[PDB]
Design an enzyme around this catalytic site. Structure first.
Site, short mmCIF file in Angstrom:
data_model
loop_
_atom_site.label_atom_id
_atom_site.label_comp_id
_atom_site.label_asym_id
_atom_site.label_seq_id
_atom_site.Cartn_x
_atom_site.Cartn_y
_atom_site.Cartn_z
N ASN A 51 3.58 -3.26 -17.58
CA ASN A 51 4.99 -3.70 -17.83
C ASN A 51 5.07 -5.23 -17.82
O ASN A 51 6.19 -5.76 -17.75
CB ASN A 51 5.95 -3.07 -16.82
N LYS A 65 4.18 -3.34 -12.74
CA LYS A 65 2.74 -3.00 -12.94
C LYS A 65 2.22 -3.82 -14.11
O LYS A 65 3.01 -4.29 -14.93
CB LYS A 65 2.57 -1.49 -13.15
N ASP A 76 10.10 -3.78 -19.97
CA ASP A 76 10.45 -2.35 -19.74
C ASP A 76 11.31 -2.21 -18.47
O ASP A 76 10.77 -1.87 -17.41
CB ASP A 76 9.19 -1.48 -19.67
N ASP A 134 9.58 -0.77 -11.15
CA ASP A 134 8.38 -0.31 -11.90
C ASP A 134 7.49 -1.50 -12.29
O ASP A 134 6.99 -1.50 -13.44
CB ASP A 134 8.79 0.52 -13.11
N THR A 148 5.87 4.18 -10.77
CA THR A 148 4.48 4.55 -11.15
C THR A 148 3.69 4.80 -9.88
O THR A 148 3.65 3.94 -9.01
CB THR A 148 3.87 3.46 -12.03
#
Lengths: 268, 13
Positions: A134, A131, A150, A129, A170
Site C-alpha cells: 500500500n 504495508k 489504498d 492497512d 492485513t
C-alpha cells in the site's frame, strides 16, 4: 459527464478487479494524472461502501507522501478516481528486488511513511492497512518519494477517540489491539510502521507462521526478536525505534510525531 | 516475505 469534459484518456498503466488505470491529462491544466476507471455495476454493497469511503477520505488528505486524490466523478455505471501519476511501483516490489534497505535508506523510507501517517492522524484519519503493498514509489529514480495509497479500509476518528471500528487489515501487519477486539485508533498505524521498518532492514517480517493461529498468538504476545547474524550489526537506536513501535499496549506505543523526533529519524 | 491481502472482516485461516 464531467470526466469526459475535463480529462483526456491515454495509455493503460495497470488493471485491478473491475477497474483499469490509464494515464490522463486535465486538458485545461496540461497536467498528467492516473485515472482509475471502476465498473460500479460489478461491485458488491461492501465494495461500494469501500469505494465511497476511499473517495471521501483520500480527498480530504493533501501530503507529498500520500497519493493525492484530485477528483472523484460518478457517471452512468462508471466511477473515475483522478490520482497522482506514480510510475515507481510498490515499495513491496522494491524490497523483493533489493532484498533489504541500508539503515540510511530504511530511515529515509520510514521518515516519509511517518510524515504521511502524522498527516492522516492530524486530519482525523486512521489508515488501518499500512504495508509495503500500500506504499508506491513516485518514479524509478533513486530517492523518489514513497507515497501512502489504498484508503479502502481507512476510517475517520474524532481526536483521540478509541472505538471498535471492526476487524480489518492485513494479517501480518494487524495490531495486538485489533486481534484482541479492543477499542482502537491512531496507534494501529504505528504498529504496522514497526512491521514495515523491521522488513526494510532485513527483508523478512517480525511475525510469520503458515499457521495463522500461531501468527496471531505471536503478534498478541509481541513475540518477535532480532536473529543473528543479520541484526548483530544493526544500531541499537534502529532496534529501539522498532521496540517502541512494536509495543503491545497501544497507550505505551510511540506516536508518529514522537517517532519523527527519534534520534534514528530526526525529521522533527 | 510474501504478498499479503487486505480483509474488511475476521476470517479464520
Amino acid at each position: 459527464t464531467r470526466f469526459t469534459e475535463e480529462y483526456q484518456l491515454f495509455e493503460e498503466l495497470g488493471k485491478g478487479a473491475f477497474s483499469v488505470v490509464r494515464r490522463c491529462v486535465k486538458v485545461l491544466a496540461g497536467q498528467e494524472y492516473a485515472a482509475k476507471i471502476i465498473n460500479t455495476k460489478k461491485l458488491s454493497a461492501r465494495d461500494h461502501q469501500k469505494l465511497e469511503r476511499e473517495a471521501r477520505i483520500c480527498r480530504l488528505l493533501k501530503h507529498p507522501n500520500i497519493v493525492r486524490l484530485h477528483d472523484s466523478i460518478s457517471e452512468e455505471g462508471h466511477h473515475y478516481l483522478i490520482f497522482d501519476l506514480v510510475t515507481g511501483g510498490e515499495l513491496f516490489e522494491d524490497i523483493v528486488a533489493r532484498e533489504y534497505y541500508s539503515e540510511a535508506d530504511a530511515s529515509h523510507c520510514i521518515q516519509q511513511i511517518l510524515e504521511a501517517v502524522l498527516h492522516c492522524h492530524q486530519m482525523g484519519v486512521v489508515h488501518r492497512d499500512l504495508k509495503p503493498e500500500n506504499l508506491l514509489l513516485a518514479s524509478k529514480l533513486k530517492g523518489a518519494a514513497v507515497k501512502l495509497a489504498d484508503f479502502g479500509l481507512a476510517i475517520e476518528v474524532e481526536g483521540e477517540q478509541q472505538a471498535w471500528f471492526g476487524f480489518a487489515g492485513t494479517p501480518g501487519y494487524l495490531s495486538p489491539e485489533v486481534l484482541r477486539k479492543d477499542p482502537y485508533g491512531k496507534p494501529v498505524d504505528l504498529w504496522a510502521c514497526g512491521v514495515i521498518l523491521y522488513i526494510l532492514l532485513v527483508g523478512y517480517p517480525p511475525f510469520w507462521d503458515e499457521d495463522q493461529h500461531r501468527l496471531y498468538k505471536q503478534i498478541k504476545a509481541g513475540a518477535y526478536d532480532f536473529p543473528s547474524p543479520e541484526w548483530d550489526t544493526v544500531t541499537p537506536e534502529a532496534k529501539d525505534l522498532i521496540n517502541k513501535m512494536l509495543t503491545i499496549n497501544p497507550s505505551k506505543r510511540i506516536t508518529a510525531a514522537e517517532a519523527l523526533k527519534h534520534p534514528w529519524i530526526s525529521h522533527r | 516475505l510474501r504478498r499479503q491481502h487486505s480483509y474488511d472482516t475476521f476470517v479464520d485461516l
